[PDB]
């Protein structure tokens, strides 16, 4: 078998990632927004 690594002979086969050679463009999954609120919790305020 070749998918295992032996250190003694520096034996480790070289291979490419399957996705790098053949892309599979499925877009993404972004139904919901995704926001970044301000630290205090309310930004601009006012005096009352």
């Amino acid at each position: 078998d070749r998918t295992r690594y032996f250190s003694m002979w520096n034996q480790a086969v070289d291979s490419y990632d399957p996705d790098v050679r053949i892309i599979e463009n499925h877009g993404t999954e972004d139904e919901l927004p995704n926001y970044c609120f301000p630290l205090g919790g309310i930004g601009i305020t006012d005096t009352f």
């Binding site: 930004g43 601009i44 305020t45 006012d46 005096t47």
Partner: protein, 113 residues
Amino acid sequence: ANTFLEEVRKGNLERECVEETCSYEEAFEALESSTATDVFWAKYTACETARTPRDKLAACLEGNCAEGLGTNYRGHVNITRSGIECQLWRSRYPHKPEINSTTHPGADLQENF
């Protein structure tokens, strides 16, 4: 002053030191023309009673009306209440004014206005 993120936007002398209680710093920052800066300051000061509403401050910027005792008036009327000619404020004729141009330079002392 309010709307904290105002200091990143460009500003409006009228959207900072008019429609809002402002710092003379933002006033200074926006004015630099320190002569008119003193003028605007004089305005603010006299307009201390013209802070609100907005159009009242606009009129106080126009300066045709005297506010309160008349510190802000900047018109062209140079005649007494009874038609007597007004003496030059800086000149000593016919009286040497203890209160004159040197003592009150910030009122924009015109010829005899």
